Structure 1
Amino acid sequence: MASMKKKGSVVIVGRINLSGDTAYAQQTRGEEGCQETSQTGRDKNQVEGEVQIVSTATQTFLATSINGVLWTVYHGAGTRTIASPKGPVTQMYTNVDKDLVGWQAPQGSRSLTPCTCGSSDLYLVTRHADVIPVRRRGDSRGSLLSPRPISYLKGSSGGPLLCPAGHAVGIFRAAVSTRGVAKAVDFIPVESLETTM
Structure 2
Amino acid sequence: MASMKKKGSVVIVGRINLSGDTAYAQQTRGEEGCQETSQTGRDKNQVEGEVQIVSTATQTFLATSINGVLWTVYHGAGTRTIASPKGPVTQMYTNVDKDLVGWQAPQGSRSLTPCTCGSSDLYLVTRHADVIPVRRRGDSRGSLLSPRPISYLKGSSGGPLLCPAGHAVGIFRAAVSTRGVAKAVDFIPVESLETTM
The bucket for the TM-score relative to the shorter chain is: over 0.9
Question: Within 1, Cα distance between the matches of 2:158 and 2:41?
Answer: 20
Q: Distance in 2 between matches of 1:148 and 1:179?
A: 11
Task: State the aligned residue count.
Answer: 197
Distance 1:139 1:152 in 2: 23
Aligned to 1:162: 162
1:156-184 alpha-carbon deviations (Å, 9 max, x no partner): 00000000000000000000011101000
**1:69: how far off?**
0.1
Aligned partners of 1:126, 1:110: CA distance in 2, in Å?
Answer: 18
Deviation digits for residues 110-150 of structure 1, max 9, x if unmatched?
00000000000000000000000000000000000000100
- C-alpha deviation, 1:109, in angstroms: 0.1
- In structure 2, distance between residues paired with 1:159 and 1:124: 7
List alignment gaps of at least 5 residues for structure 1. none
Distance 1:8 1:16 in 2: 23
Deviations 1:90-121 (A, max 9, x none): 00000000000000000000000000000000
Q: Is 1:90 aligned to 2:90, yes or no?
A: yes
Aligned residue for 1:16, secondary structure, equals strand
Structure 1 equivalent of residue 38 of structure 2: 38
Q: Aligned to 1:47, what secondary structure does the other structure show?
A: coil
Secondary structure of 1:114 counterpart: coil
**Distance in 2 (alpha carbons) for counterparts of 1:131 and 1:106:** 24
Residue 75 of structure 1 aligns to a residue whose secondary structure is: helix
Identity %: 100
SS across alignment from 2:87: coil
CA distance in 1, matches of 2:52, 2:148: 23
Deviations 1:14-43 (A, max 9, x none): 000000000000000000000000000000
Alignment partner, residue 118 of structure 2? 118
SS at match of 2:165: coil
Provide the rounded CA distance (Å) in 2 between the counterparts of 1:6 and 1:130: 35
4+ runs of 1 displaced by more than 6 Å?
none
User: Take 1:148 and 1:16, find their aligned partners in 2: how far apart are those partners?
Assistant: 20
CA distance in 1, matches of 2:117, 2:111: 17
TM-score (ref. length: structure 2): 1.00
Deviation at 1:12, TM superposition (A): 0.1
Render the CA deviation track for 1:70-99: whole Å, top value 9, x for unaligned: 000000000000000000000000000000
Three-state SS of the structure 2 residue aligned to 1:192 is helix
C-alpha RMSD of matched pairs (Å): 0.2
User: Tell me, which stretches of 5 or more residues in structure 2 are unaligned?
Assistant: none
Q: Per-residue deviation at 1:56?
A: 0.1
For residue 45 of structure 1, give the secondary structure of its aligned residue in structure 2: coil
SS at match of 2:172: strand
Q: Provide the C-alpha distance between the structure 1 equivalents of 2:71 and 2:150, rounded to a whole number of angstroms.
A: 22
